[PDB]
Amino acid sequence: LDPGLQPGQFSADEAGAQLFAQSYQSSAEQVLFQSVAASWAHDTNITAENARRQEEAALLSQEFAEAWGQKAKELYEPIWQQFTDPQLRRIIGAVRTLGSANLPLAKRQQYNALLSQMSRIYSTAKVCLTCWSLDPDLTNILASSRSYAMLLFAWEGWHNAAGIPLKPLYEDFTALSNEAYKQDGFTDTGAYWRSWYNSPTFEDDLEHLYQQLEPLYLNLHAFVRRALHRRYGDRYINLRGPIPAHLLGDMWAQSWENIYDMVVPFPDKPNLDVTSTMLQQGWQATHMFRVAEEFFTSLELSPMPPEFWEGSMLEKPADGREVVCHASAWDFYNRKDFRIKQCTRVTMDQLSTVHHEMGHIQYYLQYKDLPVSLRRGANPGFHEAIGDVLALSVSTPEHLHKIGLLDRVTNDTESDINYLLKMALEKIAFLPFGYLVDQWRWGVFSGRTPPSRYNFDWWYLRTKYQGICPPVTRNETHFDAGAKFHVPNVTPYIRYFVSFVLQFQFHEALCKEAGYEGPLHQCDIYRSTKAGAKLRKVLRAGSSRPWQEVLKDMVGLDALDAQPLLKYFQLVTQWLQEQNQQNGEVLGWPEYQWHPPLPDNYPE
Amino acid sequence: LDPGLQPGQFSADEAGAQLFAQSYQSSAEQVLFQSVAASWAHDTNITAENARRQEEAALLSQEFAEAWGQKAKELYEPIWQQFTDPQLRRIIGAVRTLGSANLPLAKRQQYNALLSQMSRIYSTAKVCLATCWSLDPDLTNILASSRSYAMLLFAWEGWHNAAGIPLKPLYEDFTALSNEAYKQDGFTDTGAYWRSWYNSPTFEDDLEHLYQQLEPLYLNLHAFVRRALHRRYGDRYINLRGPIPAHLLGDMWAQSWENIYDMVVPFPDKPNLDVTSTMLQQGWQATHMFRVAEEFFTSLELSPMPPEFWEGSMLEKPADGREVVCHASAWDFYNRKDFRIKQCTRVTMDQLSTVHHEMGHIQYYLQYKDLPVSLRRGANPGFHEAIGDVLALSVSTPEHLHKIGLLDRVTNDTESDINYLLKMALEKIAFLPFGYLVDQWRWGVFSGRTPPSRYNFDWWYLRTKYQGICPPVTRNETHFDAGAKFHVPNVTPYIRYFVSFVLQFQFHEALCKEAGYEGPLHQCDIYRSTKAGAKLRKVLRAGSSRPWQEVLKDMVGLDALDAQPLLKYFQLVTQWLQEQNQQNGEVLGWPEYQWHPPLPDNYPE
Ligand SMILES: *[C@@H]1O[C@H](CO[C@@H]2O[C@@H](C)[C@@H](O)[C@@H](O)[C@@H]2O)[C@@H](O[C@@H]2O[C@H](CO)[C@@H](O[C@@H]3O[C@H](CO)[C@@H](O)[C@H](O)[C@@H]3O)[C@H](O)[C@H]2NC(C)=O)[C@H](O)[C@H]1NC(C)=O
Ligand SMILES: *[C@@H]1O[C@H](CO[C@@H]2O[C@@H](C)[C@@H](O)[C@@H](O)[C@@H]2O)[C@@H](O[C@@H]2O[C@H](CO)[C@@H](O[C@@H]3O[C@H](CO)[C@@H](O)[C@H](O)[C@@H]3O)[C@H](O)[C@H]2NC(C)=O)[C@H](O)[C@H]1NC(C)=O
Ligand SMILES: Cc1ccc([C@H]2CC[C@@H](C(=O)O)N2C(=O)CNC(=O)[C@@H](S)Cc2ccccc2)cc1
Ligand SMILES: Cc1ccc([C@H]2CC[C@@H](C(=O)O)N2C(=O)CNC(=O)[C@@H](S)Cc2ccccc2)cc1
Ligand SMILES: *[C@@H]1O[C@H](CO)[C@@H](O[C@@H]2O[C@H](CO)[C@@H](O)[C@H](O)[C@H]2NC(C)=O)[C@H](O)[C@H]1NC(C)=O
Ligand SMILES: *[C@@H]1O[C@H](CO[C@@H]2O[C@@H](C)[C@@H](O)[C@@H](O)[C@@H]2O)[C@@H](O)[C@H](O)[C@H]1NC(C)=O
Ligand SMILES: *[C@@H]1O[C@H](CO[C@@H]2O[C@@H](C)[C@@H](O)[C@@H](O)[C@@H]2O)[C@@H](O)[C@H](O)[C@H]1NC(C)=O
Ligand SMILES: *[C@@H]1O[C@H](CO)[C@@H](O)[C@H](O)[C@H]1NC(C)=O
Ligand SMILES: [Cl-]
Ligand SMILES: [Cl-]
Ligand SMILES: [Mg+2]
Ligand SMILES: [Mg+2]
Ligand SMILES: [Mg+2]
Ligand SMILES: [Zn+2]
Ligand SMILES: [Zn+2]
């Protein structure tokens, strides 16, 4: 490590620790930037050399974390928990957590290389027999094909192509990650991930939230299963069993908005999927980002800086260059460079994804002057929620009308139910998946789920929570969890379950602050500077204050609460119950063993 | 509650608590007796009227528990946790725990009736083809001796459907009432109360650490047996990389595999260690089996069975038509006189082991009958379940079988040792995953992790995860396959048996050392060792007067459960099965976890 990056000498007291933290954040800005820059060069251009460079930068980051973590323990390990400055206590506690820097040098290299190789496998995997990529090809098949056999070939092809080669690498990664964080005092890596929420009863609190939300998912599930039965028949749909996992519009069955046109109860009413209109009007990726930006500036939040427009990758490159297409937002920790990398497609759900990613950017811009250790969300779920809150207003029929994507809708009951159903397909359907992914990974990290049960336990959870089943037989050669981006790319997932609850709490708070008075699901905070001010306070706080205090300042409550979500969907929650009762539906999937048969003469 | 049974007055300090505790135990003995008597009358003669009498006896026990429990809390709830005498803290702590007596009268009656009706359903269920088969003996003998895939399937499916399906609504109601009761005692759910009997803050982690050490032995036995079954049933019904169909292992619950020993025995030219056929040839009856078990106990200078045991016990299924609970059990009537076994005894070697298991309970009762009633239990429940099994470890040795005339030829060679250890593994190692999983299931039900909508999903998740078996016909949540196992509807906790199967080898090692035996642990026979008897007697006479960790330390030199004695016992066959599976190219485990067998072509015609 460069001598200028190595830590100096400081007194072993709170005053010296304050100086220590300043010198830490000073040098960390330079180390973080070279790491983020090298990761960016790789993710927008996957090659062996860029992987080599990214691993060089990761090693330097670990050397830096080792030097500064060791110094923090030498000086402050006995005393930092009694410092009077709470923000200093948070900084010092972080620096003394070394993570992968606890590993010997050889295992650091092994750890860094596993990350590079898992990333390459996921983002370069293809389904052949010409070859299809996940984004756009298989994504478009899953969203729009209504051919059981075609959807199956895409689902099986993708899960086999991505998951199988990842499994031996993921086993090695898990072992090294655990070895690293055990030396920080964590029982396993998952315990470190959960520690970010600073809640002794986190897992119980989540379970209690899901208990309040599960009736909503069960009724949506049964309603959608009934529509699928009519399209595909009794041979492929079991009205008392799990839904085949390839039929819900999405490779992971995690959001169901793409089958809206199959389940929309009133197709005579205006089409609330404005994708057709976006294409008819000539929207491109740049228009989508500019429209998202203008929502932020309407709230008197910040526009995207020139560095964002000049450096971002907003479309998949056409030079054949291989990229990580999964959408992501990037902070280079130099207070200047901020970018999105998205293989943007012109659809309504992509417009929502654009808002999601620009929410991260807005966060980055609002806390860019905090010390680096505080340049985080109040917790990770806060970061994933910011853009989704704005998209809730954008999706309203009235707002779509304002931006020319919808000829004004009549404010009738068929239309309110159409809208809340479409929103349920996007938000309620996701809840079980947002909850289960890290339940799976927590069990892998803890050792409850050894490699010999990776797929058994994954499908246990997928059936338990989502009520889906694999449409072809799976065994432990398969690694279907690995076919989801966040697993090989080691991005935690419980943040998205937290986000999907939190965003309705934020929405209710901002709508009240904006002066809105009508139904919560018709609120649009567009151009509310008061609502922007209340959001800006959250964003500028970073992680300087406990998320429970930041939340109470914003919404009046210091905990996650499902009531705003329930109040948002109240009308369609009632409607769905009635429909399922009238159709005599069974809620849930008591024939839990059921799997569909194979199409005749598949794969031909 | 009869005036003579109601609590009087005592001082609200520790010295008064000693007098309270002394008087509580004095009256508790009479309430215990009438309850056990009424349960005996019902279980040996299932009738509507005997069930009513048992429910009225249970209500009286609840009235007693409430009156004395409320008196303990009135006088001591804020102070008994600071008492200087830890044995007093134990008892005041038990009396403050009212259990089902926390329920209001109407719910007490509901609870008692649920227990009675769940017991009746399980023990009177039949599989009909006019002509109907009972679990014991009819279906038990099919599972043990039929090798017809279709006949075994008829018995397995028939039993699980007949017992499980009607139980499910009752079991849901029982679970809710049980939780409501124990939550008023301060437990998060009933399972937390059940686990508290082991007084170990790390109990669940301790069990998982034991199971990690044992699982490789199970995986290798499983792969070896699965190969033997494949050679008999064929590639259609056995998947060499999948779970074993749950009806092919000799036992309705696949929990002991001793009955398929003839298909797995590696060296059949050696003496046949399954002596059932010799017991039948020689005319053994139930009474002989109990007398031979008794004589092992007396050879150790432990107590014979008293006349009251022989006159009162039910040692055979009654031939007078009447319905009984056939599951083997041992009974303390809490009057220091009456002790009985109720078993529908069949003349087999595994039943001889069951006889020893039940007589181990009786011996415990005889040794601690003069302790105060609250301390008349095992150091923990796993101790109680291990006593008879320890003796049966000696009885089953080829040398001991020769002594009692059940094995003419004796041989001491490596092939005979492998045969013996494989037979013992079919009984002891095959059980371990099942002994561990049953209460994982039930803990999840009590905690609410497993709602009624997932009773069977979670049961079979655990059956496959631990035992590596699959149901041979499709199941759904109308089925309640956990309910087709005695201990679930009869509300008998199960982790005690996992504990016991580990503990019994710790006990065996210590008693063999005390007896002066200096050969391989699996050839030890403590028969006629009065030194071993005296060491076991010290455990039995302690009851629950002392923490089990201290009792274990005195007996075996360690204050914790330890898998090493079991591993040492099985070491030779552990290594042999590993080598055999490697040479045969076996896959350890069941990576085709989704696999289920097809149905027979003419099922169930
Ligand atoms: C659409 O129309 C609704 C009213 O109609 C409602 O929705 C239809 C689709 C049908 O299902 C109808 O049966 C149903 O009633 C408008 O909602 C109403 O807005 C007014 C004005 O904002 C609300 O009155 C306010 O209410 C609060 C307390 O709730 C008071 O503090 C205020 O002083 C004020 O009176 C009214 O409550 C509200 N109704 C409901 C059920 O929430 C909605 O504004 C309109 N939206 C659009 C975009 O056209
Ligand atoms: C079955 O046979 C085993 C093995 O017998 C041993 O090996 C054979 C190949 C021959 O060489 C035999 O002569 C030889 O003993 C018996 O196990 C052995 O038992 C003896 C005592 O009977 C043990 O010797 C004692 O060991 C202790 C120390 O452990 C000393 O204090 C004693 O002085 C004495 O030497 C011997 O260790 C033990 N061997 C093993 C490997 O455990 C076994 O007893 C026999 N069983 C029956 C039922 O006949
Ligand atoms: C319209 C919309 C809104 C929100 C989402 C969220 C929720 C579900 C999850 C998923 O699609 O499964 N999801 C993303 O994935 C988005 N994208 C990231 O969350 C990036 S910010 C995560 C990341 C990636 C790489 C490095 C660092 C961070 C999807 C779609
Ligand atoms: C040879 C042998 C040895 C041990 C056993 C044990 C272990 C497995 C378990 C079972 O067979 O599943 N098993 C019993 O069941 C025996 N019998 C009871 O354990 C009675 S003492 C429990 C009880 C019943 C009713 C009221 C109170 C207590 C089986 C076979
Ligand atoms: C089984 O239980 C029944 C009661 O449910 C017993 O029948 C009673 O027998 C006693 C004598 O022992 C008579 O005084 C009662 O009038 C009988 N009652 C009824 C309702 O029949 C029966 O004897 C018991 N059988 C055995 C073998 O003990
Ligand atoms: C895992 O599965 C692979 C793919 O085939 C699937 O499983 C077999 C058993 C059939 O049911 C087939 O229809 C399925 O599509 C197999 O090639 C592979 O051998 C299996 N792995 C193991 C370890 O058995
Ligand atoms: C549960 O299953 C019962 C019968 O068993 C199953 O029957 C058919 C449908 C096949 O799946 C077969 O392999 C099974 O054994 C049904 O009678 C009952 O309706 C099912 N319960 C529910 C709620 O669907
Ligand atoms: C991609 O990276 C390689 C290094 O592997 C570099 O030579 C090349 O210029 C990069 N391509 C683009 C388009 O930036
Ligand atoms: Cl997270
Ligand atoms: Cl127990
Ligand atoms: Mg989508
Ligand atoms: Mg058996
Ligand atoms: Mg037998
Ligand atoms: Zn995000
Ligand atoms: Zn027992």
Residue numbers in the entry:
A (entry chain A): 1 to 129, 135 to 609
B (entry chain B): 1 to 129, 134 to 609
What sentences appear in the manuscript?
ACE is a type I membrane protein that converts the inactive decapeptide angiotensin I (Ang I) to the vasopressor Ang II and inactivates the vasodilator bradykinin. ACE is composed of two catalytically active domains (nACE and cACE) joined by a 15-amino acid linker region. Despite the two domains sharing 60% sequence similarity, which increases to 89% in the active sites, they differ in their N-linked glycosylation, requirement for chloride ion activation, affinity for inhibitors, and substrate specificity. cACE is primarily responsible for the production of Ang II,13 whereas nACE is highly selective for the antifibrotic peptide N-acetyl-Ser-Asp-Lys-Pro (AcSDKP)14 and gonadotropin-releasing hormone (GnRH). Three mercapto-3-phenylpropanoyl inhibitors were synthesized, combining features of omapatrilat and LisW to probe structural characteristics required for potent dual cACE/NEP inhibition.
High-resolution crystal structures were obtained for the inhibitors AD014 and AD015 in complex with nACE (1.85 and 1.70 Å, respectively) and cACE (1.80 and 1.80 Å, respectively) and AD016 in complex with cACE (1.45 Å). The nACE structures crystallized in the P1 space group with two molecules in the asymmetric unit, while the cACE complex structures crystallized in the P212121 space group, with one molecule in the asymmetric unit. The exception is weak density for the P1 groups in the nACE structures, which indicates greater flexibility due to weaker binding. The less hydrophobic environment in nACE is also consistent with there being weak density in the 2mFo-DFc maps for the P1 groups of AD014 and AD015 indicating more flexible binding. Apart from AD015-nACE, all other inhibitor-ACE domain crystal complexes contain a water-mediated interaction between the ligand mercapto group and the backbone amino and carbonyl groups of Ala334/Ala356. There are no significant differences between the structure of AD015-nACE and the other complexes in this region, so this lack of water-mediated interaction may be a crystallization artifact. While the p-tolyl group of AD015 also shows hydrophobic interactions with equivalent residues Ser357, Thr358, and His361 in nACE, the P2′ environment is less hydrophobic, particularly due to Thr358. This, together with the less hydrophobic S1 subsite in nACE is consistent with the C-selectivity factor of 24. AD015 has an equivalent affinity for cACE as observed for omapatrilat, but the affinity for nACE is reduced by a factor of 10. This is likely largely due to nACE not accommodating large hydrophobic P2′ side chains.
